[PDB]
Amino acid sequence: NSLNDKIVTISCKADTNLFFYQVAGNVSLFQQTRNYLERWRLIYDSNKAAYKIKSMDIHNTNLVLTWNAPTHNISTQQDSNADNQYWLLLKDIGNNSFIIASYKNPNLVLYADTVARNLKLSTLNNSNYIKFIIEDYIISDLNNFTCKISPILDLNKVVQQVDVTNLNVNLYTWDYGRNQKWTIRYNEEKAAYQFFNTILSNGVLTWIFSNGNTVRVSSSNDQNNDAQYWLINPVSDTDETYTITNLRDTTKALDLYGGQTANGTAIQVFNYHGDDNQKWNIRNPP
Amino acid sequence: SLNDKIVTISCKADTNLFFYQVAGNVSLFQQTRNYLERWRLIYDSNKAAYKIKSMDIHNTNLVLTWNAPTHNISTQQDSNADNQYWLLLKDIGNNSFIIASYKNPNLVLYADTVARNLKLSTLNNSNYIKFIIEDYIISDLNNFTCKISPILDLNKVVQQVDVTNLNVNLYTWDYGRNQKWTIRYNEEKAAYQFFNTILSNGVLTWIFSNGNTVRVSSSNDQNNDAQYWLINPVSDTDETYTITNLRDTTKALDLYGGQTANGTAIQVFNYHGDDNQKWNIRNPP
Amino acid sequence: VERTFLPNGNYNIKSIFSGSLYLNPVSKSLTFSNESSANNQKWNVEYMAENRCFKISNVAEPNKYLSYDNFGFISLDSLSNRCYWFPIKIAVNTYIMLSLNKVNELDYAWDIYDTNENILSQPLLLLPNFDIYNSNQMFKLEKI
Ligand SMILES: CC(=O)N[C@@H]1[C@@H](O)[C@H](O[C@@H]2O[C@H](CO)[C@H](O)[C@H](O)[C@H]2O)[C@@H](CO)O[C@@H]1O
Ligand SMILES: CC(=O)N[C@@H]1[C@@H](O)[C@H](O[C@@H]2O[C@H](CO)[C@H](O)[C@H](O)[C@H]2O)[C@@H](CO)O[C@@H]1O
Questions:
Q1: Coil, strand, or helix at residue B129?
Q2: What's the Cα-to-Cα distance from B9 to each of A27, A104, B64, B277, C89, rounded to whole Å?
Q3: Looking at chain A, after which residues does the C atom sit over 2.5 Å from the next written N, breaking the chain?
């Protein structure tokens, strides 16, 4: 139930920089790509109490993680709902990791070969090579991502801190300055994110709820302030568009004043209506 | 998250059998609602594994031990040994646990329900290696049909007045069905409901739309977080609890004034730790 | 008369992890223990021509044979189809021991778990085999 239909990335506890990567029926271990090549949908069968692991490949749309019995090899094959295409997701409590066991034969579990950069089946042991990190793909893509943020009304402009001493936040033309770059961090406890401006070490995007709708950078050593935390919600049919709502009051959304696109225009929060001035592109700095 | 939690452990293959400890022997036994079936999970972060320690009051140092290389599982003195550590693997979607030996993770606990004891097996898809691990309070209270007494008088109980009057008051115990409550735990809400056994779907509710009024309502008001309650063990007791409402969690359940007489109304009150907000939850004799 | 690469007779059985630990029964499990110089560490190996496999009985209990149970453990039991072993010689007297029967439609073999090459108190299990390179599945048969 809790994982059914969820789209995730899967990385190695042994090497957190290596992700399950799919192309043309081959599964390998590869650096983060933040795209469909490393995304998988978990499909629950209640009867088997097991999951299919389906590639989000855009060309071949029916490929699932498959154990090539009787070898120890893994591939992606057309989904035929076969027992060798089903997996038990066993969460190692306290370790925040999963052992992924074959439903066909639970004596065997996925094993990460970090030097051959691929997967195989193995009997169990206490190493991290059989432990995997399964994460919502949005969190996976955004966590520790250094980005620039643009209103969809003007993708040449960005949300910025004005400078190192002026903590105000406004819309401005993109000039590659560090005051225009933000590093996103996910907090597991709060189930929310902070945006660290990269011109400071501990400066986070914050709703100053003591001054109406004002948003500013403030220090993150002010720990019990929900106003410093945000929900990042993907807009449908887009790869880079998000609504951004405040953890204190989730009805309050990151808002471009008036939908005005001039330099210096205020960034604030405002009641959520989902119009274009509350939609943001979070992107790689070029 | 699980570290230092006190839990019962029961079999997915037979949810009426629990891990049971006496004098070094572990068996599978019916629900006792006592320390003989309670275990503290002790996490070692470097091993990413747990010790499983009996809450036995006589010997306080016994842990679930695999007597390698045999098929036998027992409780032995804690010596922090590898055969005393266990991987707790939660089977997601199935809401159960596989319990694998740290000394040999290919081997997991297997419930021999016919012999009423534990052994070991390599991994498979049978229910005999799946286990339900549950906080002991939930385990004891869930589906428990009880009677509820204030500690100021263990001879009176909280009752619904009758099948037509859904008011809730104090009254003397006479074994009436209106004087008994079936406790049900909502996993989603992480809270409890009290079902009166004189009704089918009548639950104890906070009528905040009369301020402090508590009363029985139907649970045909599907989402209503005042039909729900938290139950908290008073320290170093056996049967004593505080009962707080889900809407306002400082709104504890309250005996009016401390009045231990018949017909004294039952209400919520702001939590003040006091004795007219303490309660004993018991098996009806 | 000799029919195969491994002559009939009495052997000690060792894991490649330790030259000083010897296969014997402990309760209903099989494990590797310190040299006892006794019969329970002696194993009679007999070739069976009809199936081209081997049956292996304990010298101290000559009507009990290495077999396997339904829990993944090697066991000592009376004769049955589960007592037939198909060795693969991979070195001078180092063998992988497969079950004659496919199990869960795979090759299954003796397997001993090691913690940094220590197998003390580990029971011998029957686990899947995929190749000849798994150290945990390599065993020495010493004529003695
Ligand atoms: C010049 C002017 O005030 N025009 C207003 C718009 O500002 C206004 O758009 C909203 O402005 C607020 C500012 O706090 C928020 O950004 C809000 O999301 C915008 O919708 C509209 C209202 O529809 O009316 C004028 O055009
Ligand atoms: C008649 C009267 O009010 N006497 C008061 C008690 O009410 C009071 O006890 C409290 O009463 C309130 C009312 O609902 C709550 O029930 C509360 O839990 C009780 O503690 C005591 C306080 O010591 O003082 C008088 O006797």
A1: helix
A2: 39, 27, 12, 31, 46
A3: none
Among candidate residues A224, A202, A228, A225, the one with its CA nearest the CA of residue A216: A228
CA dist., res. B10 & res. B99, Å (int): 12
Give the DSSP H/E element, type plus range, for residue B139.
Answer: helix B136-141
Q: Does B110 touch chain C (CB under 8 A)?
A: yes
Residue in B50, B108, B125, B131 to test binding to A, most A beta-carbons within 10 Å: B125
Considering the domain C1-144 in this protein, what is its CATH number? 2.80.10.50
A209 within ligand 1 shell (Cβ under 6 A):
no
Closest atom of ligand 2 to B272 CA is 18
SS3 of B44, please?
A: strand
Supply the DSSP string of A130-164, one letter for each residue: G-EEEEEHHHHHHTTEEEEEEETT-TTEEEEE--S
**Residue B18 near residue B30, CB atoms below 8 Å:** yes
Domains and CATH numbers, chain B: 1-143 (2.80.10.50), 144-285 (2.80.10.50)
Other beta carbons within 10 Å of C135:
11
Q: Where are the domains of chain C?
A: 1-144
Residues of A in contact with B89 (CB under 8 A): 90-93, 99
Which pair of tokens denotes residue B175?
A: 């074994």
Q: Would you tell me how many other CB atoms lie within 10 Å of the CB of residue B207? A: 16
Count CA within 13 A, CB hemisphere, residue B281: 23
Resolution at which this structure was determined, Å: 2.2
Euclidean distance between the first and the last CA atom of chain A, given in angstroms as a whole number: 40
Task: Report how far residue C110's alpha carbon sits from residue C134's, in angstroms, rounded to the nearest whole number.
Answer: 11
> Among all chains, which residue has been given the structure tokens 């929060």?
A269
Cα(B182)–Cα(B184) distance, integer angstroms: 6
